Amino acid sequence: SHSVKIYNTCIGCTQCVRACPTDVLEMVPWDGCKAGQIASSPRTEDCVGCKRCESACPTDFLSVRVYLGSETSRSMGLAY
Amino acid sequence: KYRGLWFPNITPPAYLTGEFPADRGFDPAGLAADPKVYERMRIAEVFNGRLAMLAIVGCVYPELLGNGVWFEVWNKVDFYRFALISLQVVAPLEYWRGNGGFGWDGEEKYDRSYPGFDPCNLTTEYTKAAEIKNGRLAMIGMFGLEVQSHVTAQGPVANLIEHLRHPLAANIGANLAHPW
Amino acid sequence: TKFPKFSQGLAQDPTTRRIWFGIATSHDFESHDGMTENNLYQKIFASHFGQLAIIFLWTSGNLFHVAWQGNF
Amino acid sequence: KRVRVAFVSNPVETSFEKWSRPGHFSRLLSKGPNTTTWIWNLHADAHDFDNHTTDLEDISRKVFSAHFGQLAIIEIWLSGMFFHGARFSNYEAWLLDPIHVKPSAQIVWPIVGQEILNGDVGGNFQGIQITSGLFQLWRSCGITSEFQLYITALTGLIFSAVLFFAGWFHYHKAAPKLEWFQNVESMLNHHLSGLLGLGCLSWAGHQIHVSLPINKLLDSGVNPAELPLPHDFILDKSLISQLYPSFSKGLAPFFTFHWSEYSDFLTFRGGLNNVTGGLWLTDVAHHHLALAVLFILAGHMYKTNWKIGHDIKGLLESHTGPFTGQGHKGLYEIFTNSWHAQLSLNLAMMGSLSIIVAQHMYSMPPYPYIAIDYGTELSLFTHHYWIGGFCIVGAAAHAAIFMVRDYDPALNFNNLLDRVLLHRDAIISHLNWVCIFLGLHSFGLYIHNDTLSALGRPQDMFSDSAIQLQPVFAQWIQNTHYLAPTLTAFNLVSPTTPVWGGDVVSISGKVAMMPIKLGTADFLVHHIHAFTIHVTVLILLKGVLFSRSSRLIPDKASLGFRFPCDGPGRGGTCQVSAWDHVFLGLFWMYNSISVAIFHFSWKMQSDVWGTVLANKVSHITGGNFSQGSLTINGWLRDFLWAQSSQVIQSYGSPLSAYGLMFLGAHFVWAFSLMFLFSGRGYWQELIESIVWAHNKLKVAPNIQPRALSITQGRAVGVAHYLLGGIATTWSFFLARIISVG
Amino acid sequence: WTTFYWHWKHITLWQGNVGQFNESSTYLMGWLRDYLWLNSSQLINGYNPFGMNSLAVWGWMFLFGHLVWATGFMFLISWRGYWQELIETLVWAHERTPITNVFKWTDKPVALSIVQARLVGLAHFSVGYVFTYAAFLIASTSAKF
Amino acid sequence: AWTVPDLADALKNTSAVAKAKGIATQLPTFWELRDALSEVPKSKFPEVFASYKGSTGTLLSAAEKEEKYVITWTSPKKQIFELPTGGAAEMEEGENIFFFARKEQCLALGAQLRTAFKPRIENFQIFRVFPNGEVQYLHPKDGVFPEKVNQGRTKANHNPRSIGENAEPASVKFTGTTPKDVQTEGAVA
Ligand code: CLA
Ligand code: CLA
Numbered sequence A: 001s002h003s004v005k006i007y008n009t010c011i012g013c014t015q016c017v018r019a020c021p022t023d024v025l026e027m028v029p030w031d032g033c034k035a036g037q038i039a040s041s042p043r044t045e046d047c048v049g050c051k052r053c054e055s056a057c058p059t060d061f062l063s064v065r066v067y068l069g070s071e072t073s074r075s076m077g078l079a080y
Numbered sequence B: 001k002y003r004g005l006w007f008p009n010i011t012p013p014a015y016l017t018g019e020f021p022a023d024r025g026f027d028p029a030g031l032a033a034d035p036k037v038y039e040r041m042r043i044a045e046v047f048n049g050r051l052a053m054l055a056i057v058g059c060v061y062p063e064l065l066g067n068g069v070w071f072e073v074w075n076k077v078d079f080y081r082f083a084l085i086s087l088q089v090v091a092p093l094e095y096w097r098g099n100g101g102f103g104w105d106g107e108e109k110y111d112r113s114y115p116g117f118d119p120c121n122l123t124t125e126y127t128k129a130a131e132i133k134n135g136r137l138a139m140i141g142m143f144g145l146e147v148q149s150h151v152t153a154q155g156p157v158a159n160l161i162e163h164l165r166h167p168l169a170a171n172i173g174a175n176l177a178h179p180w
Numbered sequence C: 001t002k003f004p005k006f007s008q009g010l011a012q013d014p015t016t017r018r019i020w021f022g023i024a025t026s027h028d029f030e031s032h033d034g035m036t037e038n039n040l041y042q043k044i045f046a047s048h049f050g051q052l053a054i055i056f057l058w059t060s061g062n063l064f065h066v067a068w069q070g071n072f
Numbered sequence D: 001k002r003v004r005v006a007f008v009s010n011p012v013e014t015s016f017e018k019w020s021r022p023g024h025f026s027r028l029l030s031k032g033p034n035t036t037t038w039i040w041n042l043h044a045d046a047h048d049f050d051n052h053t054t055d056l057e058d059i060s061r062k063v064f065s066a067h068f069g070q071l072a073i074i075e076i077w078l079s080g081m082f083f084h085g086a087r088f089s090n091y092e093a094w095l096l097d098p099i100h101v102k103p104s105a106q107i108v109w110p111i112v113g114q115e116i117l118n119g120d121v122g123g124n125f126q127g128i129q130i131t132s133g134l135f136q137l138w139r140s141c142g143i144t145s146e147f148q149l150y151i152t153a154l155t156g157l158i159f160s161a162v163l164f165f166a167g168w169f170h171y172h173k174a175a176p177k178l179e180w181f182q183n184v185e186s187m188l189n190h191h192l193s194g195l196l197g198l199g200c201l202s203w204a205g206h207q208i209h210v211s212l213p214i215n216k217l218l219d220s221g222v223n224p225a226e227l228p229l230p231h232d233f234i235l236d237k238s239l240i241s242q243l244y245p246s247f248s249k250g251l252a253p254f255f256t257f258h259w260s261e262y263s264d265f266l267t268f269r270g271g272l273n274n275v276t277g278g279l280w281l282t283d284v285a286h287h288h289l290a291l292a293v294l295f296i297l298a299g300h301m302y303k304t305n306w307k308i309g310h311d312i313k314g315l316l317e318s319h320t321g322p323f324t325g326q327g328h329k330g331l332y333e334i335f336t337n338s339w340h341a342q343l344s345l346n347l348a349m350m351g352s353l354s355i356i357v358a359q360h361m362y363s364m365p366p367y368p369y370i371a372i373d374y375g376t377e378l379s380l381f382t383h384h385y386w387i388g389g390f391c392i393v394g395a396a397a398h399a400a401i402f403m404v405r406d407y408d409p410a411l412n413f414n415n416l417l418d419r420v421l422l423h424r425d426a427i428i429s430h431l432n433w434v435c436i437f438l439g440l441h442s443f444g445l446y447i448h449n450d451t452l453s454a455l456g457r458p459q460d461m462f463s464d465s466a467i468q469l470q471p472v473f474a475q476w477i478q479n480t481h482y483l484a485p486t487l488t489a490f491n492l493v494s495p496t497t498p499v500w501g502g503d504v505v506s507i508s509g510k511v512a513m514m515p516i517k518l519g520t521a522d523f524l525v526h527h528i529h530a531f532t533i534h535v536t537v538l539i540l541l542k543g544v545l546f547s548r549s550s551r552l553i554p555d556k557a558s559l560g561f562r563f564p565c566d567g568p569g570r571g572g573t574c575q576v577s578a579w580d581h582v583f584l585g586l587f588w589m590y591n592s593i594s595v596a597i598f599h600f601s602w603k604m605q606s607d608v609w610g611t612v613l614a615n616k617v618s619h620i621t622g623g624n625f626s627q628g629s630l631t632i633n634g635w636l637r638d639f640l641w642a643q644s645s646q647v648i649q650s651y652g653s654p655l656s657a658y659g660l661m662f663l664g665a666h667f668v669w670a671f672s673l674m675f676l677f678s679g680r681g682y683w684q685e686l687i688e689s690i691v692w693a694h695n696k697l698k699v700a701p702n703i704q705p706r707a708l709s710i711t712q713g714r715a716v717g718v719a720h721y722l723l724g725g726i727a728t729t730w731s732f733f734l735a736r737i738i739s740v741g
Numbered sequence E: 001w002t003t004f005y006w007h008w009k010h011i012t013l014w015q016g017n018v019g020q021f022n023e024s025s026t027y028l029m030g031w032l033r034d035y036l037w038l039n040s041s042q043l044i045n046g047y048n049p050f051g052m053n054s055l056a057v058w059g060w061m062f063l064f065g066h067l068v069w070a071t072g073f074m075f076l077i078s079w080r081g082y083w084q085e086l087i088e089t090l091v092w093a094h095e096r097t098p099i100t101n102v103f104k105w106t107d108k109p110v111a112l113s114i115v116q117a118r119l120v121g122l123a124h125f126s127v128g129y130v131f132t133y134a135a136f137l138i139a140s141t142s143a144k145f
Numbered sequence F: 001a002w003t004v005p006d007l008a009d010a011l012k013n014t015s016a017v018a019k020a021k022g023i024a025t026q027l028p029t030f031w032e033l034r035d036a037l038s039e040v041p042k043s044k045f046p047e048v049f050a051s052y053k054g055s056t057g058t059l060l061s062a063a064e065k066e067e068k069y070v071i072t073w074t075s076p077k078k079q080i081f082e083l084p085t086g087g088a089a090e091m092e093e094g095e096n097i098f099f100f101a102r103k104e105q106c107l108a109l110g111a112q113l114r115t116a117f118k119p120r121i122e123n124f125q126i127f128r129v130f131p132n133g134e135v136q137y138l139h140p141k142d143g144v145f146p147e148k149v150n151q152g153r154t155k156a157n158h159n160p161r162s163i164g165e166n167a168e169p170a171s172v173k174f175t176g177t178t179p180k181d182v183q184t185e186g187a188v189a
């Protein structure tokens, strides 16, 4: 499976969460930023590796980061 | 069981219900009114058809390959040897077909129309109708070949090519208008 | 399936990727599963012997085919 | 009543303000540049009107007005050709001696040694030999002077100004409303009956009254200086009566339906003139007059304002059978609301028409003395083939833009378009099989021959002296077309062309046309053609049908028509967009047309073009196509290596520009691989180090250097590949056929 | 570039006409015409409609190199998504074609990866480059000497 | 409050399940369609054709052997929407059910439900269905859409640094770890 990690530079704009096509990320509460929410990645078994989240992120060098790893039928985007 | 008929507004015979493949209500001469004959006729129809299908490919394909014409084969090939050797080979096969098996009493009760020689499991009440219809087409064809053999005295590929080259000067009209 | 046994990640892959990426990572010994420095140096040293033998067999075959089928 | 002119006065103010504000048309571009990407985006997005506005009326207006600008630029280009023909040509010399003088209408200035390109073309003239067919077209029109060429070029420049005016007027001053644009039945009636109908009538009028006399006199050796001027045929009916006596009866036969009285200028002979090697102009007149009648008729078929005529929406909705659901319902709305749908259909047809033009103009040479101008013949075939291939690939592009941008599911429920999309895996998979089958059974046969030839077994080859593959259907068709004048086209004298069979037409020594025979070599090339067209359809159709979605990407439409990928996951999704299918189809169209024009060039040089002595015909490459084309080695050796001697031995001669263009095109083609084989990750990191050194010497720019985008890299790559490939063949073709033939 | 120079420089020295190299090597049409074009004559006649000579193997390996080089461009130019979507339609056709379905794969067919195809493209390109030049180099030198 | 929903309650509506099975079936083999047409007179030919309702974009064999996905929602009107598997379908007034082969297709249709309709549809629920018969509810997993912050959610895979404060790979050699997973809070499998 791919690995999605969130770093403390997040500003809780929710853009990555909106972008994700397989519901991997969600917003949980946090106190490290003004918006009082950070992104999190509970369902990384469903991550396809598209990197749409990283395209959405507006922080200078992203706060969300997808490290591609071992392939499964879920991550390989197979309908067969 | 809707089925089509061989002539527009006719009514089918009452013994032809559509119960069997490729029934089109066609028995004006009443040759299958008794059910046991209709059983044998059914086996015969499929078997004459299968043989006409083999025959018509056998007749056309060596002429396409330039190996000779089907009704002139007997001046290069001895008929009597061919027919002796063929009947020797065919006899136990035909025997077993009619018999129903290898045993003297039938025993291993097989279908003598539709044995199981089908590795692709393709057999349905539809493919049965396709087999019959292709066979009927081939029987009509082999009738054509024989009559054309006598009337035009050329091979069937030659007959086709003549019709294609000169459709008006090579057709049934022109060939029967002359003494032939 | 099983191949490649030096990579569990690849050997769980249900696609034809497993085969291709198994062949292409077979000699990269550091990246193999549970590789230690000791085991790494020992497989390098053996493979080195294997390369040497292949070179001596190659020369042996040039000599042989020229002695047998050539015009030296 | 219903069909009516409806417009708006003065909707856009003429001012140079926005000319000074680049990017004005886009919300994003108008904020100004920050990186270099902006500049490229400005050029890429300029003509994409449906991305500027949402109003279909504003889009229609821009389209109509842009069309006038295109006509203006075409008119400048034609005026140029007429002017160059009047002032820098040997047209008047060529008109006395068409067989010997070579047509030329471009002189070069003497500077840096380039004057060598002014070759010896005849008629006491030095210049560049042209291969466009202008001189033959002018002669056929009846143009004999330079004055007439001058008048035409001046009138065309005024007409170009007027068309630029119309564009400004119909956009800035009096712009039609969307209702006007949506009168498709009026448009069809007018374009068929008016533009094509009256256009054919008018041109038949010119032919009958100007082109037929002047050509008839010229073909009987009448020296163009002492020819009558064209009005003289109109004013003095005695001149035209001597040539065609039916004119003495005037228009009385026409009105009493005794049209057979005009059978001396309206013929149906068929075949080529024996003097010029062209079609007979009396046939060409009857042709255009018959077309006129059919087009005027055809344009009376749709309903506008008078209760007669067919309604198109009805007509489409009526035709619906059982396999096809709701059938042609919903199409009328697509074709009167989507400009991209129309542009797709019209490009597919225009492209197919260009290829038909090419195939019909080599076999039935329509202009005097064009058939024995072998450089013209080769050029026009090749030109029209390339134009066709490009248009067809455009048709696929615009179809995919329609699917991504203007498809409405709601209005397409269980009609044909929806049903197509419900079985798109069956369509692509069957196409895939056919392409593999044709690949193996066609290029596999060349590989067979090459290998068996090299193994020393020539009797095992697919050849006319070996295993024969004869094209028997085409032979059948050829024979039927040759016999046609005896039964099925009885009132015709000769068959339409010598190609079908018969005798060699030869003007002076040179062969105009002669029968083209087909055998094993013709069979293999034809099945190669069928293979390459099938693969190009596979790539373009896959792009149209999978433009909105696929198993891999469910929401492609939301990403759009042109996007580079959806990231390195799912195994990697590079080039999934429909734009990327158009990009790969460009290469396969290039491969397909390239093989076709090589076929033509070798077959014509080997089996048609040549010189006749008595009855023996000595072809240019001496009949080597039939045997030599059956291996790849023979294509490389007997075509590519042998016929390339002229272009590589052209330095120091007036053909040396082709030598330079040959090397230059090889260069541009190889340069394209830098863009096609790399990616922008590398280039953006290399530009970072360069930007460093500019920064250190305080000369870094405020518009930040960026590497091109993914899409733009692909676009640059295929552009430079297509340019370098096509120009290479152009150099090689013109230098060869200008030298030998 | 280094081997073309070495070769042409020796081939002209050994034949005696060093003028050929001295005159022609200063412009690129010289390389194309008096090196590639001229010294490919015997090579491409290794097998002809008339017959074949012992250069027929190098002839064939010369066209083989051309083919392998060109095949590498497919991997280098067309990229993965195109192929992943086509292979999805072939998997559909296999699954839905009767009789045949019973042949099932154990490894789900997918398109090659991004790096993999860069490597496969490079390997086709390299093999064809080497095999073409070695054919030309041996056949041309051996033909004239 | 909010409780995890059941597909069983959704699958009770037999019409909606019938429709779902109808639409998630593959188009028939030509042979089968030929046979169906063979058993009817000509007038009834479009009815046969009208009996098919699937496509080639639907579930293949993996759905039966690995997992399929189900989306349920309730529509206020009968309207045409675009399937993520190519083609169009009709949502009925009331409960709709649709089967898909990937989670990305489900959420794609969900995304269309939340953007492209004038009364927006927000009430879709997505479930994963195994061959044995276990049904796992997937989305929205806690009742609240994930873009909205909800109490009770915890941090997953959080790294408590910036990305520049990761270690160098050469510092964790032969130890079995990478720099990216050092000191990760809420590290999932
Ligand atoms: C090591 C390189 C080498 C190579 C490339 C060849 C190549 C060949 N041999 Mg030769 N051979 C070799 C060594 C080699 N030989 C040696 C050392 C001997 C003496 C034992 C022979 C004895 C021999 C005989 C009797 C014959 C050949 C023949 C041949 C030809 C056909 C293949 C064959 O039939 O051999 C079959 C192979 C053997 C008989 C034994 C080969 C032993 C070598 C060491 C194989 C291992 C190579 C290498 C290390 C494997 C690594 C590759 C891997 C990384 C993919 C082919 C040209 C045939 C021939 O002449 O056709 C015209 C033939 O009749 N060879
Ligand atoms: C004569 C003066 C004139 C002026 C001041 C205006 C002013 C304007 N026009 Mg109008 N227009 C004019 C003439 C004029 N137009 C004519 C003659 C036409 C018919 C073509 C139009 C049709 C028209 C349309 C369809 C539109 C405008 C629009 C506009 C506005 C923005 C134009 C702009 O920024 O682009 C400046 C662009 C250029 C200078 C590029 C000119 C390209 C020309 C036409 C062809 C050149 C091809 C050339 C031969 C090069 C070939 C390749 C080369 C390598 C050889 C601006 C108010 C636009 C608008 O309203 O936006 C909201 C708009 O959509 N105009």
Ligand code: CLA
Pocket (backbone or CB within 6 Å): D043, D044, D045, D046, D047, D048, D049, D343, D347, D390, D391, D393, D394, D395, D397, D398, D401, D561, D562, D579, D582, D719
């Ligand atoms: C009547 C024909 C026609 C018309 C009206 C259009 C109109 C359009 N096309 Mg379509 N198209 C066509 C034919 C046409 N196309 C053909 C034949 C092809 C296949 C090549 C395409 C393939 C195509 C694609 C792939 C795309 C379009 C797009 C567009 C739109 C924007 C174009 C733009 O902004 O580029 C501005 C113009 C340029 C940047 C000029 C490019 C110059 C080229 C690359 C080189 C020309 C070389 C020159 C001839 C010779 C050498 C020059 C010398 C200096 C060396 C516009 C709606 C685009 C779109 O998305 O809109 C939705 C788009 O992506 N078209």
Ligand code: CLA
Pocket (backbone or CB within 6 Å): D432, D433, D435, D436, D438, D439, D440, D443, D444, D447, D535, D538, D539, D584, D587, E067, E070, E071, E072, E073, E074, E077, E078, E082
């Ligand atoms: C020479 C270079 C080359 C070759 C050989 C290929 C080959 C292929 N291309 Mg590729 N392609 C190329 C360059 C090439 N391409 C380039 C430069 C690009 C642009 C980037 C592409 C882009 C491209 C796209 C976008 C597509 C293709 C497709 C294809 C496949 C077409 C189907 C086919 O004909 O298979 C038959 C195979 C061949 C003709 C290859 C040669 C096989 C030889 C002759 C047989 C081998 C010997 C064999 C063992 C003998 C068995 C029989 C014998 C014993 C009797 C084929 C594999 C298409 C495809 O896959 O559709 C199905 C497809 O969509 N290509």
